[PDB]
Symmetry: D2
Subunit: 248 residues, 4 copies
Amino acid sequence: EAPAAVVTGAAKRIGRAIAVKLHQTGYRVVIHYHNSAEAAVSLADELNKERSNTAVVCQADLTNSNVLPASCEEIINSCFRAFGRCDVLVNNASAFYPTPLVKTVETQVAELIGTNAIAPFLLTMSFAQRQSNLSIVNLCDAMVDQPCMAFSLYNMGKHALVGLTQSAALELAPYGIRVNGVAPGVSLLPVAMGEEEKDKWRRKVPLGRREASAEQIADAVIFLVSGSAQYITGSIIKVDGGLSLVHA
Amino acid sequence: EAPAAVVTGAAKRIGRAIAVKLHQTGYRVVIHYHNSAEAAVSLADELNKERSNTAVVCQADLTNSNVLPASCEEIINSCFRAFGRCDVLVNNASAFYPTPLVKTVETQVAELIGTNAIAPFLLTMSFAQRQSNLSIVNLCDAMVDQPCMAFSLYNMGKHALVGLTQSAALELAPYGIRVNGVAPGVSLLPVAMGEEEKDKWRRKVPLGRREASAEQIADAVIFLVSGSAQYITGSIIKVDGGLSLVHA
Amino acid sequence: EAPAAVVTGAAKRIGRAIAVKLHQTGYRVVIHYHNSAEAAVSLADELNKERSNTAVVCQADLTNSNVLPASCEEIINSCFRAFGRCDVLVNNASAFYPTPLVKTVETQVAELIGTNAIAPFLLTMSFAQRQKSNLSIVNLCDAMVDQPCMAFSLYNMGKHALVGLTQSAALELAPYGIRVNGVAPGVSLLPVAMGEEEKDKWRRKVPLGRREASAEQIADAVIFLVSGSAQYITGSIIKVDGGLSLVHA
Amino acid sequence: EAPAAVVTGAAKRIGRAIAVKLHQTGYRVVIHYHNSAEAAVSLADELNKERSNTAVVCQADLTNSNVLPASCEEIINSCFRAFGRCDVLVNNASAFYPTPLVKTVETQVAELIGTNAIAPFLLTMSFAQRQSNLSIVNLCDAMVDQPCMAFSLYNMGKHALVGLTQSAALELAPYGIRVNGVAPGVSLLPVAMGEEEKDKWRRKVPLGRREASAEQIADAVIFLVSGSAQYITGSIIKVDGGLSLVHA
Ligand SMILES: NC(=O)c1ccc[n+]([C@@H]2O[C@H](COP(=O)([O-])OP(=O)(O)OC[C@H]3O[C@@H](n4cnc5c(N)ncnc54)[C@H](OP(=O)(O)O)[C@@H]3O)[C@@H](O)[C@H]2O)c1
Ligand SMILES: NC(=O)c1ccc[n+]([C@@H]2O[C@H](COP(=O)([O-])OP(=O)(O)OC[C@H]3O[C@@H](n4cnc5c(N)ncnc54)[C@H](OP(=O)(O)O)[C@@H]3O)[C@@H](O)[C@H]2O)c1
Ligand SMILES: NC(=O)c1ccc[n+]([C@@H]2O[C@H](COP(=O)([O-])OP(=O)(O)OC[C@H]3O[C@@H](n4cnc5c(N)ncnc54)[C@H](OP(=O)(O)O)[C@@H]3O)[C@@H](O)[C@H]2O)c1
Ligand SMILES: NC(=O)c1ccc[n+]([C@@H]2O[C@H](COP(=O)([O-])OP(=O)(O)OC[C@H]3O[C@@H](n4cnc5c(N)ncnc54)[C@H](OP(=O)(O)O)[C@@H]3O)[C@@H](O)[C@H]2O)c1
Ligand SMILES: COC(=O)C1CCN(C(=O)c2ccc(CSc3ccc4nc(N)sc4c3)cc2)CC1
């Protein structure tokens, strides 16, 4: 039978492109979402029309709290209850906003560290405990070492996620589970950003002066879960058109 | 008058060695402690005997919680109240223990991410808000990229701490605040670990097959706070005897 | 029209698996070799039997010297003379042996730094000069460059230089639409010499499967990078190392 | 007697500041130079005026060739001939100019790769072969991962020098020789540069909107050769005011 994948924050944007590309490769997909319920159900419907009983949704808030572990347990459980197996976990869901050093701060920590690092950890624990080509792909950030000003908690979260990628690749390799990352530079710009600001970002990209397409990001996820990456674990592939190489 | 420093987890081992050497260089010091009251006061007594009214203690639990922000504020305020200024923050306090992927998990999160990463971030915000040779030094880990097996939350917390070092260096540079790290390899072994497990580590180190003393760590701290490091920010200095260069 | 690729040191092991998989993908190939003539011809004959006029051989020493620039220009030229285009350059050839700090030393320099770094730079200049489209370069790097083997300083210097080239060439050629990327094996095909008991010390240190990568596993990452699936990727180095580089001493 | 140091390219700018500061710390110095014979002899006169017999000059072209190993051996021999010992090597000499992918290219390679990497290797070999606080410091480049457009051979040379720092720290640590780097960002700008272009670069630096003084670079060199860095090997200290953390 067909393998199954969980993609977090899969209702729109890069998570959607990834669930669709996994679905096109033959996977059954759990579309996780938090607030985007209409967008999630609509995607599951399109995918089920293409092949029936191959897509389900699963709602979960990935903010850190004492119940996050149970919510991450239930996301993985949802894949096993729908499809009988869980081959691939893509940790895509992310909160992203400025937290200047100079919402309560404890809420900012919970959301930016929770969604970007703690939930990927707890999902990776549940995915491994609930156990062919098993892998986890984490959506990292190619500019983690050249951070945007006033985004310390988001940068902290994405650095922690690099640590999780390495530590989990190390500890899960004996179980045959690979863990790798895909690190966009600028890809789909934030919905609220003006065209003028989007073009200042585009102009910085050496390869094409444009942002990555969602499909370009999904291609590298597709590679790392494929049998063409069967010896790759602990690797983070930048998909950034050279942006991280550009000096100030 | 003289400059003042805060050192977190300063009662024992590396934090004590940092407190002593800052004090020897002429700083007044706040010795932070959580459980080690006796040891903290005993250090403050030794320093005040050398120079009166130059060392105070400050109790706080650095576990992440709804009150960590208030505790981190209090640590910084206690330097301002005692000494009228706060020139240096050394984020030294740290929890360390394994968290296998296959104490509640949210308690391990609160300790290993709370004290290793979130408290430094909150201390950094309070230190900056309350503001010269100002600087922060974070105690990082030289082996962050070749992590110990089953130490994924610890490793996540130390990677987050590298993220904080870089983001805070960029964001506070405009205020003349430098932010740097010191990354020990094997230093003072965890007090629990036996002498057979401890000499295995000692034999792997290129430089003299021995752990770093705490004072070797404090030496790099002293350099980074000095007038000799006035253009250095966002740098992490490994002090590991070459251990991180050794392949598997 | 089928695209064309140069693979350096393609007669055997990894560069041979790269040439074959590029050929399977529809590429015409220049099989560069230094001393391995019989193996290079035999590969070109196998590939030509699969599809006529799709493989040629090109002999060249990539040791650093006064003539290396001309040699590297000739390798690139051979691809254009054979196939009328050159889409892909794979810098795979490498010298590799210990150079303790404590052959003359200048020969060691010429061979380790020439093959691992200077020949790739010269081939990259020659490849780009001849273009000015899915054009790309892939450099074979080394996942253990920051945890080097003892007494391999010149080899380690050569492979770090190669990282620099990968990054610098990515930035400088990105306006011509040429992408530059690397693949960094950890332990793959072990040296022909080596006893099984020494090969087993290496295999046992790999977290993922306690075995070395096959040449084909490394070629797979090369194929990905030159493919339309990697169209936005430049300046990136993919480790293909079973988690080896994550393992502390 | 007093320890002795070799500083390559020590006649002008940063190598001169390093030679001065080592001398001020008590070292006798070999001032290596290539073309700047007048400035070298003039610095050695100034040092000897301050303590007689504590400075010599040594002329040598560090371009790669079949006689580079003999020239590097001669630089080390000259320190032994003048002072009877050689405690510290600083690899500071460097060629720097663009080499666009699209003088002969064989000359570009010889000068940029010879001076920045091969000469350091050969000097390191000669230093070690001729042998209580021995150490080598390589002048690296903080921007080596975000290179200047058209500087591939320079950047290749500087990357190689990081490889040399690590490999030689590992292989020489059993002889008690430490090897480390110091990585300027923007420090003394090239003489050839106009003042408008100088200012563009200054405005990029987060800490102060200014270039490093040569003395600030030398300070980090003094630290790595000092008794306070005795457990530090294989480390590279960036001295860049935050420049490498700034995104495009
Ligand atoms: N876009 C880029 O240019 C870029 C650049 C660098 C890195 N990345 C990384 O690439 C990944 C995908 O980027 P993207 O732009 O597609 O992401 P995004 O649109 O910013 O977020 C994707 C989804 O994350 C989920 N999310 C946010 N807060 C959450 C919470 N508290 N609980 C559960 N889910 C939550 C949301 O689901 P709902 O909508 O269902 O609420 C959201 O649609 C992210 O990890 C991102 O950081 C993106
Ligand atoms: N020792 C090494 O070899 C080594 C290796 C790698 C990295 N490091 C880094 O170097 C730094 C100092 O190392 P160390 O071995 O001296 O550290 P440690 O003994 O493990 O802990 C240092 C101090 O941190 C405080 N601490 C722990 N949990 C806390 C909590 N929940 N709240 C408040 N304080 C807490 C303790 O204070 P009280 O005792 O007052 O309760 C303790 O004295 C650490 O940041 C560490 O990660 C050290
Ligand atoms: N095998 C591994 O585990 C491993 C690990 C890390 C990195 N790598 C990298 O992956 C690549 C392929 O590895 P490999 O094991 O297949 O390579 P290899 O067998 O050591 O060398 C590849 C070919 O390099 C060519 N070569 C050597 N010296 C040369 C010179 N002076 N001029 C021209 N060509 C020369 C030889 O061609 P002739 O036979 O025709 O003389 C040789 O067959 C290399 O860049 C290597 O550094 C491999
Ligand atoms: N300055 C900066 O902003 C900056 C930034 C990053 C890194 N760095 C690094 O820091 C170090 C010192 O910087 P700098 O600006 O002082 O250097 P510099 O002025 O460019 O050069 C230092 C000296 O190197 C010597 N040199 C050049 N070609 C040589 C050859 N073929 N043989 C022997 N010596 C040769 C020259 O000696 P003579 O004058 O005697 O001929 C020159 O004075 C360099 O390694 C550099 O790459 C500097
Ligand atoms: C010598 O060639 C020339 O006369 C011109 C001036 C430099 N050019 C530049 O674009 C350019 C690029 C980068 C910097 C950063 S500061 C630095 C970095 C490493 C380094 N390394 C050294 N050895 S000095 C140095 C100085 C300054 C200038 C154009 C060509």
